[PDB]
Design a protein around this ligand. Structure first.
Ligand SMILES: [Mg+2]
Ligand SMILES: [Mg+2]
Ligand SMILES: [Zn+2]
Ligand SMILES: [Zn+2]
Ligand SMILES: [Zn+2]
Ligand SMILES: [Zn+2]
Lengths: 446, 446
């Protein structure tokens, strides 16, 4: 099963045929990409907010328009999927989802209202694909660059009526019915600790500082509870590399930042008429990113090494979290840098899957975002910025959907791509909930 | 070779698995969709400005979020393609193309600068897929709801340095090197009359009123020249249906409007804070659309009937033109109504192709546009409108990329889908210029 090795412009883009990405007929390669054999493992990579617009902007900047992302763009089976949410009150579609409702959709197979995690519009819990894999005896991993209580990773292990219920304090107040002391299952963090994935890596150390209001570990901080329940905690690259085993006996929990891990690139915020009134930007690497902080590609690779020791197989979800956040911040460089970061992780995943042979790799996003690529001379109502791309030309980016501080999500359907057994299921138009069924069936779970 | 019969939500969207669009594994069906056999015909459908955002918005409104476009969404092989143009001066990429540069790309295989038609950055002419099909003895048709001089249909038969050179007067001034009286090939309309496609249907009757400044029909109107060169002119649905033959001896030219044909639906324009300050809109059919004016599905059907009588096969390009135009006008109803209109034309194309068996059908857009689907409570800097959808819920649409009168094109990569032999070539990431090569090869042209 072939991954697309090179879809960059074949030559001189100004000459006939120079901008072609194809070198011959793809029929036979596509036939070789089709397999309904069972998937032993599944690696799901999510770029938060990574719509087709975000992937194009990032490719134009980092690789040039005729360039090619060796990870993101190399998946051969591609399609478009819908991710609308539901209005809790009426049960009707809500056309623009938030990250909580979308994550619940592919992780449980049931649509829900914006803000919910692991429950339907009736607030009923539904098992997640991770809980299910684990019950079947597979190793499971949840990796992200955001706080681990954030919507995307949390949806795999928590069931609460509001994404805001990070730890005990917030829960008692926002999710009283889930509050441990009110007999509920607990806050996002408490449920995370209970779920016990073999490998969990990300930010969000902060909430682990809270102390439980009830239960067996009442009085202890959630950090204390984790060590007590037998988790191996790590907080830096070095310690992370030191790990050799990760299992139910000694599950791994890496907390590399108080909040969200640091962004790869820095650049200024987009401004009103910024492509007109201001010079073009060249993004710059973040000096704080750090040698002590594992990159997404490093966290991905470690997770694969450890989960790979389970003969039954594994389920891994990897999230390039700050794409969405930088997009909300109307910060092109932060946004593009996080997409490039994600590409590196996709590469690692694809390299393993290619050699292992029974691994389904899927790359997609939870929903679309605000950023649009507009003409250089554009006079727009929102925030714009001109950037200097790898082509040595200027690309302008516009965030024009909000007058508030942060730019919002949008509802366009968007790319979904896959490689490996059962990837045919992402071709054509599908729904985000079909993703849950595709993964459950490929792994043969019940 | 199966078309996707139904990918609408299979059930109750609020229940587990109710929003699924799939009912089982797709591997086998995709294997049956793969064929490298030669294509006898090719039908290319272009929705101008119909990016993934435009398709989602129109689907949500007309069919409901969990709905399905029986034409547009029924193509089984899907991918995403890039359509960047080139800076004429530097030869570097220009990330946001206009319609002329994009149409030239798929129609000739060479990238060009914004505003060019059928020429490269050096202003050299390159033969189009239509000129090539005709030279090989295939029948050819060019159908559009815009003026026939507009960029999309023009690119198939004209080679001029500026898309503004509609007829003799504009040409003599804007494209002096092309002006007939200066020894050039002539204006867009004069070149259209020389290319002599078997079937050409659209608007733009107005420019045909100009008179040639030189040549054999000097002094006559372009309308008179057409009749004198033996074209069968028709101007209404009835005369169009009367046609029984269309060929080189008696080629058909239908001019159904002075300018662009009438839009399908009416609705007011989006406005600043329109989703807040104003009630939701329900689109209404346009009384002027007329029983005397053929619809895009009608023109497509008549064109297929006529071109089908050529044993060698045919090439037909069909354009749903006002999607782009209404999008530029910040008019949701006009925009969605043209997308629905195009779906009807895609249905007729697919019905024929499904029974004929050697027809490649491709549906895509020249570039992306401005509209974004945003939360209902959005307070945006641009123009917004709330719409009442088929789901009985409200969808809000934002045009936030221009302070000028018209909203602009954007540069995201966007969906391309196909059905038939050689459709595999649109899967994964490709470039718009690859489409010229895919069609040339599928048809076996030289
Ligand atoms: Mg996230
Ligand atoms: Mg057009
Ligand atoms: Zn999100
Ligand atoms: Zn988001
Ligand atoms: Zn266009
Ligand atoms: Zn356009």
């Amino acid at each position: 099963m072939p991954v697309l090795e090179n879809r960059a412009a074949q030559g001189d883009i100004t000459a006939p045929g120079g901008a072609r990405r194809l070198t011959g007929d793809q029929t036979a390669a596509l036939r070789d990409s089709l397999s309904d054999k069972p998937a032993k493992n599944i690696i799901l990579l999510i770029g938060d907010g990574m719509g087709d617009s975000e992937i194009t902007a990032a490719r134009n900047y980092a690789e040039g328009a005729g360039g090619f992302f060796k990870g993101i763009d190399a998946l051969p089976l591609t399609g478009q999927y819908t991710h609308y949410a539901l209005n809790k009150k009426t049960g009707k579609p809500d056309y623009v989802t938030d990250s909580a409702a979308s994550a619940t959709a592919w992780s449980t197979g049931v649509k829900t209202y914006n803000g919910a995690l692991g429950v339907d519009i009736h607030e009923k819990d539904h098992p997640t694909i991770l809980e299910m894999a684990k019950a079947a005896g597979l190793a499971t991993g949840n990796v992200s660059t955001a706080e681990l209580q954030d919507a995307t990773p949390a949806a795999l292990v928590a069931h609460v009526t509001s994404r805001k219920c990070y730890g005990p304090s917030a829960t008692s107040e926002k999710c009283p019915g889930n509050a441990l002391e009110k007999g509920g299952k607990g806050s996002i963090t408490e449920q995370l600790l209970n779920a016990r994935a073999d490998v969990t890596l990300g930010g969000g150390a902060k909430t682990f500082a809270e102390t439980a209001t009830a239960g067996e570990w009442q009085g202890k901080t959630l950090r204390e509870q984790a060590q007590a329940r037998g988790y191996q905690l790590v907080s830096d690259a070095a310690s992370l590399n030191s790990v050799t085993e990760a299992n139910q006996q000694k599950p791994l929990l890496g907390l590399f930042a108080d909040g969200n891990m640091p962004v790869r690139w820095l650049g200024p915020k987009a401004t009103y008429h910024g492509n007109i009134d201001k010079p073009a930007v060249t993004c710059t690497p973040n000096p704080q990113r750090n040698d002590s902080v594992p990159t997404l590609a490093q966290m991905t690779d470690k997770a694969i090494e450890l989960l790979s020791k389970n003969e039954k197989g594994f389920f891994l979800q990897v999230e390039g979290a700050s794409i969405d956040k930088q997009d909300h911040a109307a910060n092109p460089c932060g946004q593009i840098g996080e997409t490039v970061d994600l590409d590196e992780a996709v590469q690692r995943a694809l390299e393993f899957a290619k050699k292992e042979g029974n691994t389904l790799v899927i790359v997609t996003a939870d929903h679309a975002h605000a950023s649009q690529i507009v003409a250089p001379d554009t006079k727009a109502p929102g925030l714009t910025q001109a950037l200097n791309t790898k082509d040595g030309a200027v690309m302008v980016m516009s965030y024009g959907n909000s007058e508030e501080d942060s730019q919002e999500n949008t509802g366009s359907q968007l790319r979904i791509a896959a490689y490996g057994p059962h990837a045919a299921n992402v071709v054509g138009l599908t729904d985000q909930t079909d993703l849950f069924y595709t993964m459950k069936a490929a792994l043969g779970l019940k």
